[PDB]
Every structure is written in structure tokens, then in C-alpha cells.
RNA sequence: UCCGCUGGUUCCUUCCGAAACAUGUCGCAGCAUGACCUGACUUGAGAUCGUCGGUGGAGUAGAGCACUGAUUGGCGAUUCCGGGGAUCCCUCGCUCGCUUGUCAAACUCCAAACCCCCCGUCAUCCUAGAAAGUCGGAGUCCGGACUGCUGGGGUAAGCUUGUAGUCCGUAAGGGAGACAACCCAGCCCGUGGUUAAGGUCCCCAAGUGUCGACUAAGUGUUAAUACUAAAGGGCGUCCCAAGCCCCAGACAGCUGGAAGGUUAGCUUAGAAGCAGCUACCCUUCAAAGAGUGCGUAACAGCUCACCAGUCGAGGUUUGGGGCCCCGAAAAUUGACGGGGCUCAAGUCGACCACCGAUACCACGGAGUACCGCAAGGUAAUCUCGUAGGAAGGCGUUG
RNA sequence: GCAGCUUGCUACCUCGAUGUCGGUUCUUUCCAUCCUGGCCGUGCAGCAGCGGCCAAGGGUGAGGUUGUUCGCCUAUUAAA
């Protein structure tokens, strides 16, 4: 039977480009966001902790608040709203 | 009424050339006659019988 | 089994050796024929395919044998250089219960082709061109697809 | 008695109108919860079925060998890990590099078109109430088919199991010979008009229509289609291109020539050009040969190849195309829908006129939705319908 | 490639019933020809063979074992 764990079908989803593997840039981890500021979900495989479920890959949410070193996002899946915790290392601003 | 026609048509999976001489009262009818004759002879339509020149002879 | 059982391309490829098991060997022994060390044949003709299909290795072996016999009989042992191109990488499986767990098991090997894709190639002199055409026409008779002959190099010489 | 299993369940109109799917189940002919349908109420301003531009997600098609596995020969060496036959006398496969020829669903240095989230813009809906929320009533969890995905499996199947769109189910009317789901069209009633699909020799309304060619087989006269035969061949016929010889003369014939030497090497006697080595048997003349055949123990002439005189205009080799022919045999009598059809009533490329729906236009009428105190106003953006929800009426006895 | 005459594959119709195998009787259809009619080739002297083409008008039987179809065997026969 097929499994239904939390990392299924992520062979290429959670990979790094060949000229990207290793230590990722550190400035991406100290970026700071404010309220109501659209961001993009782009999971960085190099960081093991604070990773949202990879089904939210490539979605855009808005910041709602901060809990420690993690921002609270508001992502739409289908017709629902899902609140996703993610460290700022996996996030990326929207360029207007 | 004599005329000269030159062009290329898609015979099968390749491009050929022709120099048919068609009798006709004028030149537009010469082009039409060329198209009709090629349709009769090779089953092609008016999209693979590109006529380069219909110069009078 | 009959030839038409495994000749159409309807399903995905199935070629990874390390996952399947027990693929039987092949019969075709040598893929180069004739004078390999020569490189000065001015005419280079070849047999091409008019439709996608699968060719069993046995058909390729029969075609190679017949072309070899004809070419050696007429042109000579040192007057040509034949070279087969397509190698059989596909695998053929035959179910053998009914439809209960109908997935098959390996029975042979096949080589897929594509339209206008060269299969054989013969190089000869100017005096043995007709013999080359005569040889390549029999080889295409054992082959499971319509085939036409194209003179690739030295077309102005022969034509 | 009980059953999740079979049969039956009685009047009219009006408004709206599905699911044959997911999870759990001693669950698979059942049921619960959710998706989908319907009625009412609360709140009070936005929403996104669509277009364009941008910030992002790609790892599929295709393509390729840069990783992982395979794969074809040539060349140069591994002075190994190796098999062939006391200096391992030396052969040398596996292997490592340069070049050639193939691959991949569980390969990728590459890499689309669809598609998804968000921002701006246009566009449509909306105070006659967007988005959201609360409560009442359900049906449904036997599906099927067509067009795409070379979908997966299977020899294949009107097979089985997926996915996107649209349909039948529950869809009239027009056309396909008849046709659940194919083409036009989604339908209140009556009258007039013009068209769509499709057709115009007769059956059958409207063309024995026009222009240019092809087919000689009754081939064909069959959009899709579960209903239509293949490889191979044709000096059958209609076209295009490319070479070669050519009126001081090309091809088919009329002619003879093919004489020098030889009776080639040959043992059987003899395979004397035609069992078996060779070579152009003539310095030389068109011709003259080691040469096919009637003949041929051997031959021999007759003469093959091969040229020469002769007529008197085109001849010849190949490649790519259209139609047709052979390949092609089944059981009641018979299926282009039928009659029949040959410069067509068939095929190919174009064109003109007309016929033909409930579609579209106009007029009159009914009902409905919403608003308005009423009178009445708006409706291209209202009128199909099974399970089912809701509203108003008719009838029988008291 | 053709046929659907062997066995498979599928589950489209029939479970408020479409009465199974073999033989017997009687009628008919197909040709992919066993004999009878006509032709062609031969490594066809004659006789008799071998191979192929047209042709479905007529014929294609009697018995022993076995439930058998199928198949084996016997003596005839133009062929059984
Ligand atoms: Mg690919
Ligand atoms: Mg139920
Ligand atoms: Mg449809
Ligand atoms: Mg419908
Ligand atoms: Mg209808
Ligand atoms: Mg109802």
C-alpha cells in the first residue's frame, strides 16, 4: 500500500540546485517582516527545523504575527484559510 | 492565352518544382487552372501549391 | 509468438535493467560488417523507416544475415562496410490465472524506432551501387515496417 | 415475530433542482459524517467564472549524456585485480583515456505549452443585498458514454482500472436508413418571415448546376463511429524533377560481320568457348571473340558478347506523387437506405443559386421573479427536467 | 493475413427456468474439391503417379470394439 506520511512525493520538491547545495546565504535568515506584508513560501531543504508542510510550496500568504522566531502566515488552500508557522529562512518577500 | 507558371508544391513529404504551361484567356484564370490541375493530379489543396510567378508567355 | 503481438507503441518504455529481472540474451553477434579499417567509400546509402514500431532482435538478425550474404556474394569481402545502428534496449513481457495479477514476465528484447530514422548503412564503390541497392532491398523484406532507401553521400555521383 | 431482501403506495398547477464521490464500519445488495440540492433568518460591501502586465512554484513533453545504470566499433595503454599453455619464453579478455553508434518509468548540465498562489488594471455580479454565519427538510455512496492524456494492465476485446471537458441518466425539436449519450439546438401558446446542421436524378422539398482534371474497377456512391482488410507487386494509367545518347542520324528492325588463331589448360578417347588453371587467342582490320545458345564424345560451323552500312525522330535510367488492379474463400435469398448511376447520379480542387427547425426576427397572449401605497414598472442578461425541497388550489363524507 | 469450424479471455443478454452429450429421421446452405467434367506443368515413353487452376450438377455406402464425438480395424467401392 502507498504510505501517507508527511514527506511523500518530495523527491524533486525538496532538492537543492547543483550550484546551491551546502550552506545557504545567511542574510536570508535575518530578514524582518511587518504586519500585512505579502510573502512567498520557498522551502529551503538545508534547514531541518521550522519547515511547513511542503504542500504549501509556491503559495503566497500574508503575515499575521510573530511567535518567537517564526511568523504566522495565512495561506489559502482550495477555499479554506490555513495558518502556517514558518521561520523567516523559508520565506521571501514580494517585489512590487 | 499562353502563360508560364513556376512554383513549388508538397509532393508527399518533400518539396518539388514545376514549370507547367497552361492555356487560358487571362492570368488570374491561369493561376486558378494551375491550382485546380494540381488538386486533381496530386490531391493537394490551395495551401501547398505556392505559385512563385505566373508570367505571360 | 507472432510478429504483430509486439510491434505497436502503445505504452511507456520499460528498459531499466536493475529493476526488472531475468531478461534473456540476444542473437545478434556483431554490429559492424565488412572492412572496418577502410574509410574511403564515396557512396553511403542507408535503409530508413516510414513508421514507428518495435523490431524484435530476431528480425534484425535475419535482416543482417541476408544483407551480409548478398553483399559478400556480389560486391566482395573487402568492397563494403555495413553497420547496424539500433540496439535493442526495450524488454518484452508475455503474461503466463486469467486476468488475476495479469502483469507479465520478461520474454525478449526489442528496439524501438522513429519515422525517417536510419537502421542500416552500406558504403561501396561506384561500380557496386546497384548491388548495394539489391542487398538493402532484401533486408527490408524481413523487417516489420515499410522501408525506403536513401542515398546519403555521393548522390551526384550515382545520380 | 423479524430481515440491510422482493412487489405495491390513489388529485391539479407553479418556483428551484442533484449524487452515482471521499473517510469509518464483521463493510461490499446496508448505514453514519462531509461534498452536491432546497427553505427561512441574521449581518451589511464587497466578490472573482474571464482578459492583460508583473513578483513566484515548477521538473512533465521534447532534448541530452554533465551524475546513476546500460550500449556499438576503431585507436593508445592498463606494464596489475585476469584466461590461454623455471626467465611466467610472449600471447592477452575485464578495465582506464581519445574518437564513432544507440538508450532510460523509478537518469538529468538543460527545458516548454497548459496549470496554481498573490498584486495592479479592465470586465461582469452587487444595498431590489456581495462575502460570511445560524437553523429546518432531504435524496445519493450499482453508473454509462464520446473527445484528448503514445494514460496503467492485457495478445487483443462493445475488456478492466484512472484523469480534464462535455453529455445520457433527467433533454424535446431538425439531420444522419433505423441510432440513450454523433452534428445543429437547450423547449410557455398562436400567426408571419429568414436561416443553422444537412441536402438539391426519382423515392423526397430544392441543380440531370458551373469551371479544371482523374477513375473503367459497378471500384466507389460509409464525417466520427465497437459498423470500414494487410505486407508485397503492377513495361495499368495521369503528373513533377533529375541524369545519359540524339536528325552531321539515338532506339526497334533490315542486313551481313563476329574471318586472323586454337583443335585453350583436358588424365579418361572425350568433355578442345560452354566439368576442371588462365588470361582481351591476332602485330590488325567496323567485326573477330577464350565464347551464351540450336547443335555440342570433343568439337565444328549456325555463331554470343561486341561493334559496322541501312532507314529518319525522339529514345533511355532513376527518384517522388494521384487513382485503380492482383494479393481477396462461408455457410436461408439481399443490402451504396432502394431504384439506378460511367466527359457520372463516383474521386480531387474551387464556385454559384435554392430548399430546410420550436434556432433568430416581428406581432398578440399566459405565467413567473423583483420593485411600487396603488395605478403600474423592468426582464438580451426569465420559462427543459428524474430523486428531491417549497407555494397555492380542486374533490369526497361529516 | 483470412475463417470463427479447437481451447482460452471478458461478463453485454437470460436465474417469477430459452429442457444438456451421442445416435436416429428429414430438409437445406458453404467451398477451403474425396470421386465424376475441363485444362496447365513434370526429373510426364505407355499404364499409373506428383503439383496447380476452373467447376458445388450428382455421388460420398456396409460392418467389429466403445455412450461416445473423435479414433482404430475389416471386405467392397468410381470415392467411400
Ligand atoms: Mg522523453
Ligand atoms: Mg442508500
Ligand atoms: Mg459529447
Ligand atoms: Mg443534461
Ligand atoms: Mg432526437
Ligand atoms: Mg418530483
Number of strands of chain B: 3
| Distance separating the two termini of chain B | 8 Å
Strand line-up of the largest beta sheet of chain B: 2-1-3
Report the order of strands and helices of chain B.
EEHE
What is the 3D shape of chain B?
A: globular
Could you tell me the number of beta strands of chain C? 6
Number of helices of chain B: 1
Name the helicity range of chain B: 25-40%
Q: Supply Rg of chain C.
A: 18 Å
Based on CA atoms alone, the radius of gyration of chain B comes out at 11 Å
Task: Write down the overall geometry of chain C.
Answer: elongated
Terminal CA distance of chain C:
43 Å
Strand content of chain C: 15-25%
* Bound small-molecule species: magnesium ion
Side-by-side strand order of the widest sheet of chain C: 5-1-6
By secondary-structure content and strand pairing, the structural class of chain C works out as: alpha+beta
Oligomer: part of a larger assembly
Largest sheet of chain B: 3 strands, antiparallel
Q: Could you say which structural class the secondary elements and strand pairing of chain B correspond to?
A: alpha+beta
In DSSP terms (H or I, runs of 4 or more residues), the helix count of chain C works out at 3
Write out key terms for the chains shown:
part of a larger assembly, 3 chains, A: mainly beta, C: 159 residues, alpha+beta, 3-stranded antiparallel sheet, 6 strands, 23% strand, binds magnesium ion
